[PDB]
Amino acid sequence: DGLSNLARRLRFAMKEGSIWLGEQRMILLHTAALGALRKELVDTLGMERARGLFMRMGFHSGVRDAELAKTMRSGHSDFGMLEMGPCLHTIEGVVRVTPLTVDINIAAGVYHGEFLWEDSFEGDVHRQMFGVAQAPVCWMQIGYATGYTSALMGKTILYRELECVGCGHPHCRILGKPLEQWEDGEAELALYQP
């Protein structure tokens, strides 16, 4: 439903050699190509520095998709507004999202969201070049959620992966909530600065 609706805002304009999602120009990019960039970045700047670059890239994508969802706001509930995010992420072929428990009220600054991630392109791309890892590896995907939800709520909303396919788990699972409700929220917020 949310997919069908938002999918109509994705258009291919070959006569411009361009692709548009709402107001934003998009490119189709091979995950292998992004994966080899990630490898170079990790290999030369280190896992931590690379994680941040990607999280902030994901952050701007999410902010942009939130602007797009903001225009499509009429008739939609707060949850329906939130749902567009997972939907765009899915349309963009990034990940398949299933909302598990979602508590939102934008007026009241209420947000607590848990989501299932399946077929995370990031997790199964890190795998093909690093194998399994200690910490969660879907950095760009997390930044997108963070970006999208913070833009929607008009306040800092951070996300963490509780489990991730690149750690060896069967799925990625994420939790989003306001900066105040994270035990190390200040360290988390830092990663989103250049």
Ligand X SMILES: Cc1ccc(O)cc1C
* Annotation: binding site for Zn(2+): 138, 161, 164, 172
Do 82 and 102 meet the contact criterion of CB atoms below 8 Å apart?
yes
Q: Which stretch in 8-16, 36-44, 63-71, 123-131 sits in contact with Zn ion by CB under 5 A?
A: 123-131
Interface with ligand X, residue 176, by CB under 6 A = yes
CA distances from 104 to 59, 82, 116, 140 (A): 20, 8, 17, 23
Say which entry of a second copy, ligand X, Zn ion, none residue 138 contacts (CB below 5 to 8 A, set by partner kind).
Answer: Zn ion
Q: How far is the CB of 5 from Zn ion (least distance, A)?
A: 27
Going by DSSP bridges, is the β-strand pair 110-118/18-21 parallel, antiparallel, or unpaired?
A: unpaired
Q: How far is the CB of 31 from a second copy (least distance, A)?
A: 5
Interface with ligand X, residue 66, by CB under 6 A = no
Among 53, 82, 138, 164, binds a second copy (CB under 8 A): 53
Q: With 0-12 CB in 10 A as exposed, 13-18 as middle and 19+ as buried, what is 113? A: buried
Do 173 and 114 meet the contact criterion of CB atoms below 8 Å apart?
yes
State how far the Cα of 191 lies from the Cα of 194, in Å rounded to an integer.
8
Q: How far is the CB of 132 from ligand X (least distance, A)?
A: 22
Residue of minimal CB distance from ligand X?
A: 85
Among 52, 86, 113, 123, binds Zn ion (CB under 5 A): 123
Residue 45 in tokens: 């700047």
The residues that touch a second copy, with contacts defined as CB under 8 A, are 3, 7, 10, 12, 14-19, 21, 24-34, 36-37, 40-41, 43-45, 53-54, 56-58, 60-61, 64-65, 89-97, 118-119, 121, 124-125, 194
